[PDB]
Amino acid sequence: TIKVFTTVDNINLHTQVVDMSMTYGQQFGPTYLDGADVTKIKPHNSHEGKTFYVLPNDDTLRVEAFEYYHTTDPSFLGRYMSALNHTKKWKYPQVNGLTSIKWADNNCYLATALLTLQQIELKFNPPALQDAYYRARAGEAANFCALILAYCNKTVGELGDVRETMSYLFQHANLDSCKRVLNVVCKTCGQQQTTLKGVEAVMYMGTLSYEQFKKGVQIPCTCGQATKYLVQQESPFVMMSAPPAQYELKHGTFTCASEYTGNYQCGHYKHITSKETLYCIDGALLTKSSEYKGPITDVFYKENSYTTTI
Ligand SMILES: Cc1ccc(N2C[C@H]3C[C@@H]2CN3C)cc1C(=O)N[C@H](C)c1cc(-c2cnn(C)c2)nc2ccccc12
Ligand SMILES: [Cl-]
Ligand SMILES: [Cl-]
């Protein structure tokens, strides 16, 4: 026999006692240790005193599960533990003061998102996301990367899009105060203004230039071509995205950007960040230059309050 702590959040610990004749699944259900499925494994002598993750099987664990993860998905823990088994083996080197990831298991899009998150202002709603976010900014990013995969319904090795990953993460963050007011001017229909809140207010797909979005872009109208432009923007940042194309990044005019080279889906991401000079972070590799020209698909800008002059 061995005394054992079970948990769903690694906060509230529930004392249990097991007999070593029965595997952990026979007494706790699906059980995990440091990301390893110890369900069909009988208790060992070193397993005494440790804390294990268990699938919620009573109401107390279900409530503690939601309050920490903000999900009731019964598959979340398993997917989370399965990713952590890989992410805990990745290397997370410090590059230019930022925590990056050495290349492994097609994680280039995860490293780019990780580096981007360390340069924009985000408050995550699930306490599990926020705690791992803090630990990741301090260098321990294995649990944060595993949570990103689980929250995005992606597995280790799967090909990932950075813009889609940031969008899913934005939906789990507090962006209620974010507001975008647009105005569409059609030659026949007239003018009409709409207001966007939340995640829809901080992302645009179509162009990389924040200035071009302020000056207006061409969109088709219901009557078959109108023009939309940005009237007001209330957000700590904006994300401008477009299909990969050659683009010149000027120092001091942007926060960071996503470079994408190669074919659709199976390409490779690099991260460009604007400090005292332009830096390029490719996993564990770092290069710098005063100017940059390359295939860019995401650009991030700082913002607070903006009102047009039209
Ligand atoms: C690396 C990766 C992993 C997965 C996926 N997937 C897309 C769909 C299916 C799967 C998952 N998602 C549900 C895509 C890419 C990818 O390649 N991302 C680059 C930036 C890219 C984006 C676009 C684009 C995006 N939105 N729009 C109108 C266009 N076009 C591209 C065209 C050529 C080359 C790169 C392009
Ligand atoms: Cl929620
Ligand atoms: Cl691995």
Ligand SMILES: [Cl-]
């Ligand atoms: Cl949430």
Ligand SMILES: [Zn+2]
């Ligand atoms: Zn929530």
Ligand SMILES: [Zn+2]
């Ligand atoms: Zn692996």
Ligand SMILES: [Zn+2]
């Ligand atoms: Zn890659």
Ligand SMILES: [Zn+2]
């Ligand atoms: Zn979710």
Ligand SMILES: [Zn+2]
């Ligand atoms: Zn109309």
Ligand SMILES: [Zn+2]
């Ligand atoms: Zn019209």
